[PDB]
């Protein structure tokens, strides 16, 4: 049983879904243009409701956290990280664990580094701490939503309508490509050494969007972290292999 609602955080009404009665609070952070509705159905349904209280949030401009419309300033990952932690604090949780996918994993890393006393444990997958030329070209190949597969475009087009979906995707490409021009193409390389909580980095070996070297790099600089490789996993491993992923996450969180 899942409840959807909005809470006022930093000047915006953020939408979120919540389920479970457990004493261990867990926030699910979605990826690019994501939402709890499109990115975490399996987790909101199957994560142990006796052990955890699960919340899936929609970053400002994404999902149902509209208005406002989405924009990508240089500090957009940091802004999301603040909103994410403030949202859980607004919901009265004293400490939480983070499950971040893609852009949400980048967001989670930043949150753990900036608010260490608030984060218990973290599980992230499909994230990258910096942008290379290879990454930049991958992003550019995502700009045109009309070239997306029908299966991948359908859910987002239905959630946002073609116009907003297409425009926001282009803004995302420009937004994440901007980091390439900064020293080291940096997004959060400098924050990895500041993560103090136990972290599990999962990577789908067949992920076509994020090369494994990005997972190796995060594992290398997040002290005490563990890296788990899934031979058949792709970018959406928590959806395609939900049962396998949920077990990995639940075992690590306990
Ligand atoms: Mg360098
Ligand atoms: Mn929503």
Swiss-Prot record:
The modification N6-succinyllysine is found at residues 89, 147, 154, 223, 234. GO terms for molecular function: alpha-amino-acid esterase activity; serine hydrolase activity. Residues 25-144 form the AB hydrolase-1 domain. It is found in: Mitochondrion. Changing residue 102 to A: <0.1% of wild type valacyclovir hydrolase activity. Mg(2+) binds at residue 184. InterPro entries: AB_hydrolase_1, AB_hydrolase_fold. Expressed at high levels in liver and kidney and lower levels in heart, intestine and skeletal muscle. One of its GO terms (cellular component) is mitochondrial outer membrane. The record marks 103 as: Binding of alpha-amino group of substrate. Keywords: Acetylation, Hydrolase, Magnesium, Metal-binding, Mitochondrion, Signal. Its EC number is 3.1.-.-. Specific alpha-amino acid ester serine hydrolase that prefers small, hydrophobic, and aromatic side chains and does not have a stringent requirement for the leaving group other than preferring a primary alcohol. Has homocysteine-thiolactonase activity (in vitro) and may play a significant role in the detoxification of homocysteine thiolactone in vivo. Catalyzes the hydrolytic activation of amino acid ester prodrugs of nucleoside analogs such as valacyclovir and valganciclovir, converting them into their active forms (acyclovir and ganciclovir). This is Serine hydrolase BPHL. It comes from Homo sapiens (Human). The gene is BPHL.
């Amino acid at each position: 049983s899942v409840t959807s609602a909005k809470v006022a955080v930093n000047g915006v009404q953020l939408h979120y879904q919540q389920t479970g009665e457990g004493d261990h609070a867990v926030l699910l952070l979605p990826g690019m243009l994501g939402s709890g509705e499109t990115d975490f159905g399996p987790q909101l349904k199957n994560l142990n409701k006796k052990l955890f209280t699960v919340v899936a949030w929609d970053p400002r401009g994404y999902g149902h956290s509209r208005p406002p419309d989405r924009d990508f300033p240089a500090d957009f990952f940091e802004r999301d990280a603040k909103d994410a932690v403030d949202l859980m604090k607004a919901l009265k949780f004293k400490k939480v664990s983070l499950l971040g996918w893609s852009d949400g994993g980048i967001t989670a890393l930043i949150a753990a580094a900036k608010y260490p006393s608030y984060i218990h444990k973290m599980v992230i997958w499909g994230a990258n701490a910096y942008v290379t030329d290879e990454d930049s070209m991958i992003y550019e190949g995502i700009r045109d939503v009309s070239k997306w597969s029908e299966r991948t475009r359908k859910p987002l087009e239905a959630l946002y309508g073609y116009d907003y979906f297409a425009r926001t995707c282009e803004k995302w490409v420009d937004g994440i490509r901007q980091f390439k021009h900064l020293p080291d193409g940096n997004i959060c390389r400098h924050l990895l050494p500041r993560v103090q909580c136990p972290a599990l980095i999962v990577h789908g070996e067949k992920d076509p969007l994020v090369p494994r070297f990005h997972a190796d790099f995060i594992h290398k600089h997040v002290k005490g972290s563990r890296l788990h490789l899934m031979p058949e996993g792709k970018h959406n491993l928590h959806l395609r292999f939900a049962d396998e992923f949920n077990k990995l996450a639940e075992d690590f969180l306990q």
